């Protein structure tokens, strides 16, 4: 064995195979290499007959492992062997392990690959490293899937239906797969992931120039590897997360930095990345944005109201579209009858063309003067207002539809034909916004703006155009928000609509939501519930009880999203949000989410602590449970210590009225 050594870590590298264990010396925990096949890496490539296989690079014909410096090991995997015995001559992989001399940090990097006459695709490296042993380690995998989840490495008590779906998923394909970085679907929103047990934690931060995928395996024994062979898996149930380097696409540095934290968990992991988020320039705090624009202070304690009039999907849709007098009346009722002190009114359906032509203010709905009357009223309440804007759609039912604004690829093929809301080439979108946004700001006296779709993901293609649009919007110094967002857009916006959870998502039945993104960025970006899954809808992510309680735990604002005809049905939830979530949201708005803990064995009772001096304890399940000190938290209940010393206690109640 080769040993790299500093004060905190022992790195033990097998010179025959290239596998390495990591001894974290403060706690004595040893992270093993691949417990299944002793594979340092898993390479996917075509063979001589062109079919693609995955090989264990530790079975390569030649393996060179050598220490070059006191802290650097070079590894070369030369001529891998296929399962039949055929050799991929001319194929090689070079990697490096680099131990930091002072900190508990190990950089792992794929530095070179060579294809021969073969084609290389995926490299899992390190392969199945830093695993937890299911039901031996008590801990979790930590995954920034949108707002974030953890995946416990052991079976625990929970509701009988959830228990069945949980355990069953760890024995089928629901517990294995891959996730992509920086999208608004199923993927990750921060470039890191980790595992921890009762002794120590390890996380890995992907290099800023790279875009691997992340393979996950949640308590699965690898039966998926053997189902096509029709034999039973001989492996142990483990938890692992692996980087998937896309050798056929990766232009960046294929480097991941591992950080080892004794006695840490997902909270410690988030704070480690938070330092890295600042160095990368993503972190622009809400206090800095408030210095630049005092109207940012209209956000703390505001309910986000989406009034959906069938637009952008349809112009003047019968039964859905609102008149500007109706908009005015809804705003007035929210203030005068419902006594909402602070609100963000987002009117979806104010223009008579389809997006991306966000003009003119629709005459059929009342015209500019009546929209201005509604906006004037909201401004007199101190509310923020914005119309719906988007500069990326190109809709089939728009009479102005044109492919002139769409992007084509090298073959001349239209891109995004199957994604109507994101069809305009971003290099056009500042110019599309320039057509009317300034006329609308000037005429209505706007103090805020929401822009949708364009900033929901962060992909390389078109990012220059999107940055241009972002700079142009931010140059107005309005309180501005955007749909979903990503960390890269944090410097340009004050709030994100979303950054919570999809309803149907990989891992939903074998993970618990954790406020991983807000553990990093709550000080820098305010977020609200997503409009497709608002706090007034009952979905896989809960009803109003669960969603209101989680809002306070996680530090996001209320979203009430509705068609106008629904308004009277919203009053009770508007009032409950006004009385419970809004004061807490107002107090914690600018502060750091310092810690989050799960207090019950079924993870339903949680405690969050904010640097404003606020503590939120909530119980997302139906039975009351006791925590430390004998204090009992009711089902769908809360115990909130406010900065002013008041202790808000109570719970949600469902009652049956039988006339």
Ligand X SMILES: O=S(=O)(O)O[C@@H]1[C@H](O[C@H]2O[C@@H]3CO[C@H]([C@H]2O)[C@H]3O[C@@H]2O[C@H](CO)[C@H](O)[C@H](O[C@H]3O[C@@H]4CO[C@@H]([C@H]4O)[C@H]3O)[C@H]2O)[C@@H](O)[C@H](O)O[C@@H]1CO
Residue 165 binds to a second copy (criterion: CB under 8 A): yes
Look at residue 172 and give the partner it binds from Cl ion, ligand X, Na ion, none, a contact being a CB closer than 5 to 8 Å depending on partner kind. ligand X
Look at residue 494 and give the partner it binds from Na ion, Cl ion, a second copy, none, a contact being a CB closer than 5 to 8 Å depending on partner kind. Na ion
Residue 234 binds to a second copy (criterion: CB under 8 A): no
Report the 3 state secondary structure along 127-173.
CCCCCEECCCCCCEEEECECCCEEEECCCCCCCHHHHHHHHHHCCCH
Residue 417 binds to a second copy (criterion: CB under 8 A): yes
**Among the listed residues 182, 144, 184, the one whose alpha carbon sits nearest the alpha carbon of residue 533:** 184
Backbone angles phi, psi at 94, to 5 degrees: -115, 130
Number of residues that bind a second copy (CB under 8 A): 100
Q: Which residue of this chain has its Cβ atom nearest to ligand X in the complex?
A: 185
Our CB check for Cl ion shows the closer of 500 and 508 to be 500
* Distance in Å, CB of 526 to Cl ion, minimum: 13
Residue 101 binds to ligand X (criterion: CB under 6 A): no
What one-character-per-residue DSSP string does 435-446 give? TTHHHHHHHHT-
Q: How far is CA 50 from the centre of its chain?
A: 37
Contact with Cl ion (CB under 5 A) among 245, 308, 381, 554: 554
Are 238 and 197 spatial neighbours (Cβ–Cβ below 8 Å)?
Answer: no
Are 108 and 100 spatial neighbours (Cβ–Cβ below 8 Å)?
Answer: no
Pairwise CA distance, residues 462 & 189, whole Å:
18
3-class DSSP assignment, residue 231 = coil
Q: What tokens appear for 43 in the block?
A: 């390479």
Our CB check for Cl ion shows the closer of 305 and 554 to be 554
Our CB check for Cl ion shows the closer of 317 and 576 to be 576
Task: For residue 384, list its beta bridge partners.
Answer: 344
Are 352 and 358 spatial neighbours (Cβ–Cβ below 8 Å)?
Answer: no
Our CB check for a second copy shows the closer of 92 and 323 to be 323
Our CB check for ligand X shows the closer of 165 and 379 to be 165
Pairwise CA distance, residues 357 & 560, whole Å:
26
Residue list 464-503, contact with Cl ion (CB under 5 A): 500
Residue list 500-529, contact with Cl ion (CB under 5 A): 500
* Distance in Å, CB of 186 to ligand X, minimum: 5
Residue 186 binds to ligand X (criterion: CB under 6 A): yes
Our CB check for ligand X shows the closer of 243 and 426 to be 426
> Omega into 83 within 30° of 0, i.e. cis?
no
Report the chain's terminal Cα–Cα distance, integer Å.
79
Return the ∠ at Cα 478 (arms to 474 and 479), rounded to 5°. 105
Our CB check for a second copy shows the closer of 21 and 649 to be 649
* Distance in Å, CB of 518 to Na ion, minimum: 19
Residue list 482-521, contact with a second copy (CB under 8 A): 503-504, 508
- Residues 6+ positions from 3 with CB-CB distance below 8 Å: 10, 11, 12, 13
Contact with a second copy (CB under 8 A) among 116, 156, 460, 626: 156
Look at residue 554 and give the partner it binds from Cl ion, a second copy, ligand X, none, a contact being a CB closer than 5 to 8 Å depending on partner kind. Cl ion
Contact with a second copy (CB under 8 A) among 226, 359, 443, 598: 226
* Distance in Å, CB of 581 to Cl ion, minimum: 11
Positions touching ligand X (CB under 6 A) are: 164, 168, 172, 174, 184-186, 312, 419, 421-422, 452-453, 456, 483, 502, 504-505, 531
Positions touching Cl ion (CB under 5 A) are: 500, 550, 554
């Amino acid at each position: 064995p080769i040993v790299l050594e500093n004060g905190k870590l022992n790195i033990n590298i097998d010179s025959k195979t290239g596998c390495f264990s990591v001894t974290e010396k403060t706690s004595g925990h040893v992270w093993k290499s691949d417990p299944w096949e002793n594979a340092a890496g898993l390479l996917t490539l075509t063979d001589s007959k062109g079919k693609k296989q995955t090989v264990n690079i530790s079975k390569s014909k030649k393996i060179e492992v050598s220490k070059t410096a006191k802290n650097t090991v070079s590894l070369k995997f030369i001529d891998p062997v296929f399962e039949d015995g055929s050799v991929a001559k001319g194929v090689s992989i070079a990697t490096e392990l680099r131990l930091d001399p002072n900190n508990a940090q190990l950089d792992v990097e794929v530095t070179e690959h060579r294809s021969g006459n073969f084609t290389l695709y995926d490299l899992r490296y390190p392969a199945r490293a830093f695993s937890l042993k299911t039901d031996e380690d008590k801990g979790a995998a930590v995954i920034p899937q949108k707002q974030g989840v953890i995946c416990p490495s052991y079976i625990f008590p929970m509701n009988g239906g959830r228990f069945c779906k949980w355990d069953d998923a760890t024995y089928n394909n629901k517990s294995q797969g891959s996730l992509e970085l920086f999208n608004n679907g199923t993927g990750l929103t921060m470039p890191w992931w980790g595992t921890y047990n009762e002794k120590s934690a390890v996380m890995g931060i992907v290099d800023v120039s790279a875009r691997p995928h992340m393979q996950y395996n949640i308590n699965n024994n690898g039966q998926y590897l053997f189902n096509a062979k029709g034999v039973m898996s001989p492996y142990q149930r483990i938890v692992f997360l692996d980087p998937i380097w896309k050798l056929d696409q990766e232009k960046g540095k294929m480097r991941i930095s591992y950080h080892f934290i004794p006695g840490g968990d997902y909270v410690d992991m988030a704070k480690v990345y938070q330092k890295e988020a600042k160095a990368r320039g993503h972190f622009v705090s809400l206090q800095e944005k408030l210095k630049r624009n005092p109207n940012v202070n209209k956000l703390p304690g505001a309910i986000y109201f989406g009034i959906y009039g069938g637009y952008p999907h349809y112009v003047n849709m019968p039964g859905m579209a609102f008149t500007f007098d109706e908009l005015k009346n809804i705003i007035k009722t929210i203030h005068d009858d419902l006594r909402v002190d602070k609100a963000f009114v987002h009117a979806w359906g104010t223009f008579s063309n389809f997006v991306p032509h966000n003009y003119p203010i629709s005459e059929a709905l009342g015209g500019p003067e009546k929209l201005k009357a509604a906006v004037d009223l909201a401004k007199s309440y101190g509310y923020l207002y914005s119309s719906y804007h988007a500069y990326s759609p190109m809709l089939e039912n728009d009479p102005n539809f044109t492919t002139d604004l769409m992007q084509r690829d090298a073959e001349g093929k239209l891109m995004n034909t199957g994604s109507r809301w994101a069809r305009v080439d971003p290099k056009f979108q500042k110019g599309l916004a320039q057509k009317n946004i300034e006329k609308e700001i000037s005429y209505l006296g706007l103090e805020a703006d929401i822009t949708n779709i364009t900033f929901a993901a962060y992909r390389e293609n078109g990012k220059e155009g999107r940055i241009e649009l972002a700079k142009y919007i931010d140059s107005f110094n309005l309180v501005n928000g955007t749909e979903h967002g990503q960390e890269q857009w944090i410097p340009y916006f004050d709030m994100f609509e979303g950054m919570t959870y999809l309803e149907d998502r990989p891992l939903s039945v074998i993970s618990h939501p954790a406020p991983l993104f807000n553990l990093v960025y709550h000080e820098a970006i305010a977020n609200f519930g997503k409009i497709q899954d608002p706090d007034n809808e009952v979905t896989a992510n809960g009803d109003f009880r669960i969603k209101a309680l989680r809002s306070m735990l996680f530090g996001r604002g209320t979203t009430i999203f509705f068609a106008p005809y629904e308004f009277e049905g919203m009053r009770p939830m508007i009032e409950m949000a006004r009385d419970l979530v809004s004061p807490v949201h107002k107090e914690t708005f600018y502060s750091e989410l310092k810690s989050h803990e799960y207090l019950s064995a079924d993870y339903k009772v949680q405690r969050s602590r904010f640097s404003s001096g606020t503590e939120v304890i909530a119980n997302l399940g139906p039975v009351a449970q006791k925590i430390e000190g004998g204090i009992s938290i009711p089902g769908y209940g809360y115990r909130i210590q406010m900065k002013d010393g008041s202790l808000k206690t109570g719970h949600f109640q469902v009652s049956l009225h039988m006339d």
